Amino acid sequence: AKVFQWFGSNESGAEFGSQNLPGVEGKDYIWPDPNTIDTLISKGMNIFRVPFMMERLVPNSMTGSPDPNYLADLIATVNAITQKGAYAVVDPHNYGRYYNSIISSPSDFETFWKTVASQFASNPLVIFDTDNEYHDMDQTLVLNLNQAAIDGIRSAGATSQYIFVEGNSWTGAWTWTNVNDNMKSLTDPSDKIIYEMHQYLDSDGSGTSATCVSSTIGQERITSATQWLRANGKKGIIGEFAGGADNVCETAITGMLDYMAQNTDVWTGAIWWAAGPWWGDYIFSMEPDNGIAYQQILPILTPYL
Hints:
Protein name: cellulase
CATH architecture: Alpha-Beta Barrel
Strand order of the largest sheet: 1-2-3-6-7-8-9-10
Helix content: 25-40%
Order of helices and strands: EHEHHEEEHEHEHEHEHEHH
CATH topology: TIM Barrel
Distance between the termini: 7 Å
Radius of gyration: 18 Å
Largest sheet: 8 strands, parallel, barrel
Strand content: 15-25%
EC number: 3.2.1.4
Family: Belongs to the glycosyl hydrolase 5 (cellulase A) family.
Keywords: Glycosidase, Hydrolase, Signal
Number of helices: 10
Number of strands: 10
Catalytic activity: Endohydrolysis of (1->4)-beta-D-glucosidic linkages in cellulose, lichenin and cereal beta-D-glucans
Shape: globular
């Protein structure tokens, strides 16, 4: 059986070409392929994270009406995942920013989240992710935006679903404890907050190089966060991680996941970055049937499924 509550992949593409807003489906961005998601489910993956742009889903003002056509594809993608019994993570992949300006109004953000959650309120397999990778912004604001999201979600009657909260510092696991301590004060009447951290293995933790620092760097970089979660009685997820298809990265990945598997009292699982249809020869592609991580990394993930 499965080692973790959740183990799966990001399904990237709806957030592509972000300099073009709204942009054009099939030209600037694309939604995930349900057929290749099905393949990942057959391999044992049970969670799929779906990035999208806030501005494409709710144009101009985040308190306004959704765009019906982009919403239609978000719904279709999400419900196709959940119809197969997998969890679907709704990820406004926005960096704490809307038209590249910091989201400074928790109340506006709460209305955005009631709008979004109302589209999925009765689906217990949807997971709401408040925002991808807050960074370079006020730490109390980040707390308040996460809380506003939770409040908006629950106000819509979407009470069955987990909520993935994200911290500042690009929600990095390695930087969590001295940046994001205040995030322990988030509240949820459903008691379904998961602290989503991201952890890359290259020098600067940006996940842009296929080269990992060392064969133990993953374990090393999530150790402090693991202790923080335990000390605070919280649960976490690694919502993005990756490494190159090479020996040092594969060893680091195994080491990190084996470490997590020893600490399942706090770690709910892990989500690879990334599958999706427009990655080609991308160093981290988990897209069946020919992504490099699909072919060379999935065999080292299978032990957890």
